[PDB]
A paper describes a structure:
Human Pim1 kinase is a serine/threonine protein kinase that belongs to the calcium/calmodulin-regulated kinases (CAMK) group. In contrast to other protein kinases, Pim1 kinase is constitutively active, and its activity is primarily regulated through protein expression and stability rather than posttranslational modification, although regulation by phosphorylation has been reported. Pim1 has a typical serine/threonine kinase fold comprising two domains [N-terminal domain (NTD), residues 33–120; C-terminal domain (CTD), residues 129–305], which are linked by a hinge region with a unique LERPXPX motif and the gatekeeper residue (Leu120). The ATP binding pocket is between the NTD and CTD, and it is surrounded by the hinge region, glycine-rich loop (G-loop, residues 46–54), and activation loop (A-loop, residues 191–202).
Author numbering: 33 to 306
The structure:
């Protein structure tokens, strides 16, 4: 019984995902987030383990839901006449990385190192669970401000991870690789690495490097803010024009700029607690 179990709260957002409301699970007064997805608007569908058909978004969330805190977790879900409703964790207090970056501008490297590190573990998690996010960016990342933990959200453009070429893509253009732009083809891992690179530039310069199609393909990176040489290196590396030339996840995490990561809590005390 959907509307017995939860107590609708304020619309928290509307965008390329749909309509998200704050909610309380009356059953234990747990802070949750209720999201509505219209059937008419879902272009990608998938089969539950049971195999019955849901929106891919749900398939992907089930697959990563256990047991990490790196990724937002799907509690439950329901079907309606024209919509599916998803019940997902709600951290509080929370802010998303974009809003965070807009308020506080470009970030200290020690902080960007922490976040960026945590994003890496959350993308590894998804890859490990057989899931490709396809829309990694500041908007799709929440900062739990007390714990200093980051959570990856919004699997609405995602896909089951595979080793072959993808030829569809409905994520955020500006974070998409040159080879998508030029050839409508890409591979999951390599494209994720690219997006991970735009994100890093974003963290450390307070804004994305490439705005237009031509600059993405040109692939040449200008820094508008004092950035460490080691960090500029990992960035230019992540954004190698040729996919095979890009760093794997291991290599990013074994990079000299990635060393000495703060722990999440530590990061909150040092940077998030005012």
């Amino acid at each position: 019984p959907l509307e017995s179990q939860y107590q609708v709260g304020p619309l928290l957002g509307s965008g390329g995902f749909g309509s998200v409301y704050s909610g309380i699970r009356v059953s234990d007064n747990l802070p949750v987030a209720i999201k509505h997805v219209e059937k008419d608007r879902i272009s990608d569908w998938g089969e539950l383990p049971n195999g019955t058909r849901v929106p891919m978004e749900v398939v992907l969330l089930k697959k990563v839901s256990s047991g990490f805190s790196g990724v937002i977790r799907l509690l439950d879900w329901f079907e309606r006449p024209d919509s599916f409703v998803l019940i997902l964790e709600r951290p509080e207090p929370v802010q998303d990385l974009f809003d965070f970056i807009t308020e506080r501008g470009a970030l200290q490297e020690e902080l960007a190192r922490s976040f960026f590190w945590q994003v890496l573990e959350a993308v590894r998690h998804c890859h490990n669970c057989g899931v490709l996010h396809r829309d990694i960016k500041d908007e799709n990342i929440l900062i739990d401000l007390n714990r200093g933990e980051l959570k990856l959200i919004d699997f609405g453009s995602g896909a089951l991870l595979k080793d072959t070429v993808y030829t569809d893509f409905d994520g955020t253009r500006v974070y998409s690789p040159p080879e998508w732009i030029r050839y409508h083809r890409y591979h999951g891992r390599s494209a994720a690495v690219w997006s991970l690179g735009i994100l890093l530039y974003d963290m450390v310069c307070g804004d994305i490097p490439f705005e237009h199609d031509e600059e993405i393909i040109r692939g040449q990176v200008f820094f508008r803010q004092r950035v460490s040489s080691e960090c500029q290196h990992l960035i230019r590396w992540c954004l190698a024009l040729r996919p095979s030339d890009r760093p794997t996840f291991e290599e990013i995490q074994n990079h000299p700029w990635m060393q000495d990561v703060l722990l999440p809590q530590e990061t909150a005390e040092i940077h998030l607690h005012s």
